[PDB]
Amino acid sequence: RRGYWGNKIGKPHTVRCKVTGRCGSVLVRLIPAPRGTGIISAPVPKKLLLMAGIDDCYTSAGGCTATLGNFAKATFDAISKTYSYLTPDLWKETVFTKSPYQEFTDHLVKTHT
RNA sequence: UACCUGGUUGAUCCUGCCAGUAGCAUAUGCUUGUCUCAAAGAUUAAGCCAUGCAUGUCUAAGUACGCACGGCCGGUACAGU
């Protein structure tokens, strides 16, 4: 989930909110950034965030980032939390639409599992 | 540009320092066409010093008998310089 800096002009360029993600003494602090600053990070998370389409970000690390297996999994952990972070936009209540499992069950009553 | 990478082990995750990285100002090595700007015996010995120079000054208007120059003849405030 991508978001904006402090104002709108369409097409989100950065992270919605300031989030973290930890994997066994490594953590990352993805901080939002204004347009055109580029991704300011180490080489390892610069891969992931660039592929994500998050084109602007400030970061900072803490702990042993030498063992990169932790470092990248902790980045990926942070990138997950974006839709698991509650924002005032999402406060309006969902309509609880029926599941595809329910509606399309008619074709699956043959022998299908 | 709010950034990290290598090194303790058979292998893994930490703690931790060492090394790598960029700027700045002094010395030094090697090299060097053209253009502008210019810091420069402070670091150490506020150690010691040859020679040369670096503070003098007169307007119509303080004092002109320089045997100076000049004079158009002088002085009688008395010339001009």
Side-chain angles (χ1 to χ4, degrees), chain A residues 24-25 40-42 58-59 61 65 67 70:
Chain A
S25 71
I40 296 169
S41 304
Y58 283 113
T59 59
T65 45
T67 50
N70 296 103

Short mmCIF file of all heavy atoms in Angstrom, two decimals, chain A residues 24-25 40-42 58-59 61 65 67 70, chain B residues 1-6 12-16:
data_model
loop_
_atom_site.label_atom_id
_atom_site.label_comp_id
_atom_site.label_asym_id
_atom_site.label_seq_id
_atom_site.Cartn_x
_atom_site.Cartn_y
_atom_site.Cartn_z
N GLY A 24 14.72 -10.82 14.31
CA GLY A 24 15.79 -11.28 15.19
C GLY A 24 16.99 -10.39 15.31
O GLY A 24 18.09 -10.82 14.97
N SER A 25 16.76 -9.14 15.77
CA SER A 25 17.69 -8.09 16.19
C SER A 25 18.04 -7.18 15.06
O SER A 25 18.87 -6.30 15.23
CB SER A 25 19.04 -8.51 16.87
OG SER A 25 19.99 -9.11 16.00
N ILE A 40 16.63 5.98 -0.42
CA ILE A 40 17.84 6.27 0.30
C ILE A 40 17.87 5.15 1.29
O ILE A 40 17.10 5.14 2.25
CB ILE A 40 17.76 7.63 0.98
CG1 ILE A 40 17.65 8.73 -0.11
CG2 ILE A 40 19.00 7.83 1.88
CD1 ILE A 40 17.29 10.11 0.43
N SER A 41 18.67 4.11 0.97
CA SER A 41 18.76 2.90 1.74
C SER A 41 20.06 2.25 1.39
O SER A 41 20.79 2.71 0.50
CB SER A 41 17.65 1.85 1.43
OG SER A 41 16.34 2.38 1.59
N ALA A 42 20.35 1.11 2.06
CA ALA A 42 21.47 0.22 1.80
C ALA A 42 21.21 -0.53 0.51
O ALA A 42 20.12 -0.38 -0.04
CB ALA A 42 21.64 -0.79 2.95
N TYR A 58 12.87 7.10 3.21
CA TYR A 58 14.01 7.28 4.07
C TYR A 58 13.98 6.06 4.94
O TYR A 58 12.90 5.54 5.23
CB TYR A 58 13.92 8.51 5.02
CG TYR A 58 14.20 9.79 4.29
CD1 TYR A 58 13.19 10.75 4.11
CD2 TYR A 58 15.49 10.08 3.84
CE1 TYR A 58 13.46 11.97 3.50
CE2 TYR A 58 15.78 11.32 3.24
CZ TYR A 58 14.76 12.26 3.06
OH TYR A 58 15.04 13.50 2.44
N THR A 59 15.16 5.56 5.37
CA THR A 59 15.25 4.34 6.13
C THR A 59 16.33 4.55 7.14
O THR A 59 17.03 5.56 7.12
CB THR A 59 15.58 3.09 5.30
OG1 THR A 59 16.82 3.21 4.61
CG2 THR A 59 14.46 2.84 4.28
N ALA A 61 18.62 1.53 9.89
CA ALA A 61 18.73 0.15 10.28
C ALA A 61 19.20 0.16 11.70
O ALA A 61 19.63 1.19 12.22
CB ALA A 61 19.73 -0.64 9.43
N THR A 65 23.33 -6.15 10.35
CA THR A 65 22.79 -6.19 9.01
C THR A 65 23.73 -6.92 8.09
O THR A 65 23.45 -7.08 6.90
CB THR A 65 22.55 -4.78 8.47
OG1 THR A 65 23.64 -3.91 8.74
CG2 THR A 65 21.29 -4.22 9.15
N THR A 67 24.46 -10.18 8.33
CA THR A 67 23.77 -11.42 8.07
C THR A 67 22.49 -11.11 7.33
O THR A 67 21.42 -11.04 7.94
CB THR A 67 23.48 -12.19 9.36
OG1 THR A 67 22.85 -11.36 10.33
CG2 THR A 67 24.80 -12.72 9.94
N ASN A 70 18.43 -12.05 7.66
CA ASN A 70 17.62 -11.30 8.60
C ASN A 70 17.18 -9.99 8.03
O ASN A 70 16.00 -9.65 8.09
CB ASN A 70 18.38 -11.00 9.91
CG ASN A 70 18.70 -12.31 10.65
OD1 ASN A 70 19.84 -12.79 10.61
ND2 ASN A 70 17.66 -12.88 11.32
"O5'" U B 1 21.17 14.47 -1.42
"C5'" U B 1 19.94 14.34 -0.72
"C4'" U B 1 19.79 12.99 0.00
"O4'" U B 1 19.98 11.88 -0.91
"C3'" U B 1 20.82 12.77 1.13
"O3'" U B 1 20.19 12.17 2.28
"C2'" U B 1 21.84 11.84 0.48
"O2'" U B 1 22.54 11.05 1.42
"C1'" U B 1 20.97 11.00 -0.42
N1 U B 1 21.74 10.36 -1.52
C2 U B 1 21.72 8.98 -1.67
O2 U B 1 21.09 8.25 -0.91
N3 U B 1 22.47 8.49 -2.74
C4 U B 1 23.26 9.24 -3.64
O4 U B 1 23.91 8.69 -4.53
C5 U B 1 23.21 10.66 -3.40
C6 U B 1 22.47 11.15 -2.38
P A B 2 19.75 13.14 3.46
OP1 A B 2 18.43 13.71 3.14
OP2 A B 2 20.85 14.08 3.76
"O5'" A B 2 19.59 12.13 4.67
"C5'" A B 2 20.78 11.59 5.26
"C4'" A B 2 20.49 10.71 6.49
"O4'" A B 2 19.43 11.26 7.33
"C3'" A B 2 19.99 9.30 6.13
"O3'" A B 2 20.44 8.34 7.10
"C2'" A B 2 18.48 9.49 6.18
"O2'" A B 2 17.79 8.27 6.32
"C1'" A B 2 18.36 10.35 7.40
N9 A B 2 17.06 11.04 7.46
C8 A B 2 16.53 11.92 6.56
N7 A B 2 15.35 12.36 6.89
C5 A B 2 15.05 11.73 8.07
C6 A B 2 13.90 11.81 8.88
N6 A B 2 12.87 12.63 8.50
N1 A B 2 13.94 11.03 10.01
C2 A B 2 15.02 10.27 10.24
N3 A B 2 16.15 10.13 9.53
C4 A B 2 16.11 10.90 8.44
P C B 3 21.67 7.41 6.75
OP1 C B 3 21.94 6.52 7.90
OP2 C B 3 22.79 8.25 6.28
"O5'" C B 3 21.12 6.57 5.54
"C5'" C B 3 20.35 5.38 5.72
"C4'" C B 3 20.97 4.20 4.96
"O4'" C B 3 21.26 4.54 3.58
"C3'" C B 3 22.32 3.70 5.53
"O3'" C B 3 22.42 2.27 5.45
"C2'" C B 3 23.33 4.41 4.64
"O2'" C B 3 24.58 3.78 4.61
"C1'" C B 3 22.64 4.36 3.30
N1 C B 3 23.15 5.38 2.35
C2 C B 3 23.64 5.03 1.08
O2 C B 3 23.63 3.83 0.74
N3 C B 3 24.12 6.01 0.27
C4 C B 3 24.08 7.32 0.64
N4 C B 3 24.57 8.32 -0.15
C5 C B 3 23.51 7.68 1.91
C6 C B 3 23.08 6.70 2.71
P C B 4 21.86 1.37 6.64
OP1 C B 4 20.99 0.32 6.07
OP2 C B 4 21.27 2.23 7.68
"O5'" C B 4 23.18 0.71 7.23
"C5'" C B 4 23.72 -0.51 6.71
"C4'" C B 4 24.60 -0.31 5.47
"O4'" C B 4 25.33 0.94 5.57
"C3'" C B 4 25.71 -1.35 5.24
"O3'" C B 4 25.17 -2.50 4.59
"C2'" C B 4 26.71 -0.56 4.42
"O2'" C B 4 26.29 -0.44 3.08
"C1'" C B 4 26.66 0.80 5.09
N1 C B 4 27.71 0.95 6.16
C2 C B 4 29.06 1.00 5.82
O2 C B 4 29.37 0.97 4.61
N3 C B 4 29.99 1.12 6.81
C4 C B 4 29.62 1.16 8.12
N4 C B 4 30.53 1.30 9.13
C5 C B 4 28.24 1.05 8.48
C6 C B 4 27.34 0.94 7.49
P U B 5 25.53 -3.96 5.10
OP1 U B 5 24.59 -4.93 4.48
OP2 U B 5 25.62 -3.96 6.58
"O5'" U B 5 26.98 -4.21 4.52
"C5'" U B 5 27.15 -4.61 3.16
"C4'" U B 5 28.64 -4.69 2.80
"O4'" U B 5 29.28 -3.41 3.02
"C3'" U B 5 29.50 -5.66 3.63
"O3'" U B 5 29.37 -7.00 3.14
"C2'" U B 5 30.87 -5.06 3.44
"O2'" U B 5 31.36 -5.35 2.15
"C1'" U B 5 30.59 -3.59 3.54
N1 U B 5 30.74 -3.10 4.96
C2 U B 5 32.01 -3.07 5.51
O2 U B 5 33.01 -3.40 4.87
N3 U B 5 32.06 -2.64 6.84
C4 U B 5 30.99 -2.24 7.64
O4 U B 5 31.16 -1.90 8.82
C5 U B 5 29.72 -2.27 6.97
C6 U B 5 29.65 -2.68 5.69
P G B 6 29.70 -8.22 4.11
OP1 G B 6 29.27 -9.47 3.45
OP2 G B 6 29.13 -7.95 5.45
"O5'" G B 6 31.28 -8.22 4.23
"C5'" G B 6 32.09 -8.67 3.14
"C4'" G B 6 33.58 -8.67 3.53
"O4'" G B 6 34.00 -7.31 3.85
"C3'" G B 6 33.98 -9.46 4.78
"O3'" G B 6 34.12 -10.86 4.48
"C2'" G B 6 35.28 -8.78 5.16
"O2'" G B 6 36.33 -9.15 4.30
"C1'" G B 6 34.93 -7.33 4.92
N9 G B 6 34.38 -6.71 6.15
C8 G B 6 33.07 -6.40 6.42
N7 G B 6 32.89 -5.88 7.60
C5 G B 6 34.14 -5.86 8.15
C6 G B 6 34.50 -5.43 9.44
O6 G B 6 33.70 -5.00 10.26
N1 G B 6 35.90 -5.57 9.64
C2 G B 6 36.81 -6.09 8.70
N2 G B 6 38.11 -6.15 9.11
N3 G B 6 36.41 -6.50 7.47
C4 G B 6 35.09 -6.36 7.28
P U B 12 27.82 -19.87 8.47
OP1 U B 12 27.45 -19.06 7.28
OP2 U B 12 29.00 -19.43 9.23
"O5'" U B 12 26.58 -19.92 9.43
"C5'" U B 12 25.28 -20.31 8.99
"C4'" U B 12 24.33 -20.22 10.18
"O4'" U B 12 24.75 -21.12 11.23
"C3'" U B 12 24.25 -18.87 10.88
"O3'" U B 12 23.40 -18.00 10.12
"C2'" U B 12 23.71 -19.28 12.25
"O2'" U B 12 22.33 -19.50 12.21
"C1'" U B 12 24.41 -20.60 12.51
N1 U B 12 25.58 -20.46 13.43
C2 U B 12 25.33 -20.18 14.76
O2 U B 12 24.19 -20.05 15.20
N3 U B 12 26.47 -20.07 15.56
C4 U B 12 27.81 -20.22 15.16
O4 U B 12 28.73 -20.14 15.98
C5 U B 12 27.96 -20.48 13.76
C6 U B 12 26.88 -20.58 12.96
P C B 13 23.66 -16.45 10.15
OP1 C B 13 22.79 -15.81 9.14
OP2 C B 13 25.12 -16.19 10.05
"O5'" C B 13 23.18 -16.01 11.59
"C5'" C B 13 21.78 -16.05 11.89
"C4'" C B 13 21.54 -15.82 13.39
"O4'" C B 13 22.16 -16.88 14.15
"C3'" C B 13 22.11 -14.54 14.01
"O3'" C B 13 21.23 -13.44 13.71
"C2'" C B 13 22.18 -14.94 15.48
"O2'" C B 13 20.91 -14.88 16.08
"C1'" C B 13 22.62 -16.38 15.40
N1 C B 13 24.10 -16.51 15.57
C2 C B 13 24.69 -16.53 16.84
O2 C B 13 23.96 -16.45 17.84
N3 C B 13 26.05 -16.65 16.93
C4 C B 13 26.84 -16.69 15.83
N4 C B 13 28.20 -16.80 15.91
C5 C B 13 26.25 -16.60 14.53
C6 C B 13 24.91 -16.50 14.46
P C B 14 21.77 -11.96 13.91
OP1 C B 14 20.70 -11.01 13.57
OP2 C B 14 23.06 -11.82 13.19
"O5'" C B 14 22.06 -11.89 15.45
"C5'" C B 14 22.93 -10.87 15.97
"C4'" C B 14 23.13 -11.12 17.46
"O4'" C B 14 23.69 -12.43 17.68
"C3'" C B 14 24.09 -10.18 18.17
"O3'" C B 14 23.44 -8.96 18.53
"C2'" C B 14 24.51 -11.03 19.36
"O2'" C B 14 23.49 -11.06 20.34
"C1'" C B 14 24.63 -12.40 18.74
N1 C B 14 26.04 -12.71 18.31
C2 C B 14 27.06 -12.79 19.25
O2 C B 14 26.80 -12.62 20.46
N3 C B 14 28.32 -13.06 18.82
C4 C B 14 28.60 -13.30 17.51
N4 C B 14 29.86 -13.62 17.08
C5 C B 14 27.55 -13.24 16.54
C6 C B 14 26.31 -12.95 16.97
P U B 15 24.20 -7.59 18.37
OP1 U B 15 23.25 -6.48 18.62
OP2 U B 15 24.94 -7.57 17.09
"O5'" U B 15 25.24 -7.64 19.55
"C5'" U B 15 24.85 -7.57 20.92
"C4'" U B 15 26.08 -7.79 21.82
"O4'" U B 15 26.62 -9.13 21.60
"C3'" U B 15 27.28 -6.87 21.55
"O3'" U B 15 27.10 -5.61 22.22
"C2'" U B 15 28.41 -7.71 22.12
"O2'" U B 15 28.43 -7.66 23.53
"C1'" U B 15 28.04 -9.10 21.68
N1 U B 15 28.72 -9.47 20.39
C2 U B 15 30.01 -9.94 20.45
O2 U B 15 30.61 -10.07 21.51
N3 U B 15 30.56 -10.22 19.20
C4 U B 15 29.97 -10.10 17.94
O4 U B 15 30.56 -10.44 16.92
C5 U B 15 28.63 -9.59 17.99
C6 U B 15 28.07 -9.30 19.18
P G B 16 27.54 -4.28 21.48
OP1 G B 16 27.25 -3.14 22.37
OP2 G B 16 26.91 -4.25 20.14
"O5'" G B 16 29.10 -4.39 21.29
"C5'" G B 16 29.99 -4.47 22.40
"C4'" G B 16 31.40 -4.87 21.94
"O4'" G B 16 31.37 -6.18 21.30
"C3'" G B 16 32.04 -3.97 20.87
"O3'" G B 16 32.61 -2.80 21.49
"C2'" G B 16 33.04 -4.93 20.25
"O2'" G B 16 34.16 -5.11 21.09
"C1'" G B 16 32.29 -6.23 20.23
N9 G B 16 31.62 -6.46 18.93
C8 G B 16 30.37 -6.03 18.55
N7 G B 16 30.04 -6.39 17.34
C5 G B 16 31.12 -7.09 16.88
C6 G B 16 31.31 -7.68 15.62
O6 G B 16 30.47 -7.68 14.71
N1 G B 16 32.60 -8.26 15.53
C2 G B 16 33.56 -8.27 16.54
N2 G B 16 34.74 -8.86 16.19
N3 G B 16 33.32 -7.74 17.76
C4 G B 16 32.11 -7.16 17.85
#
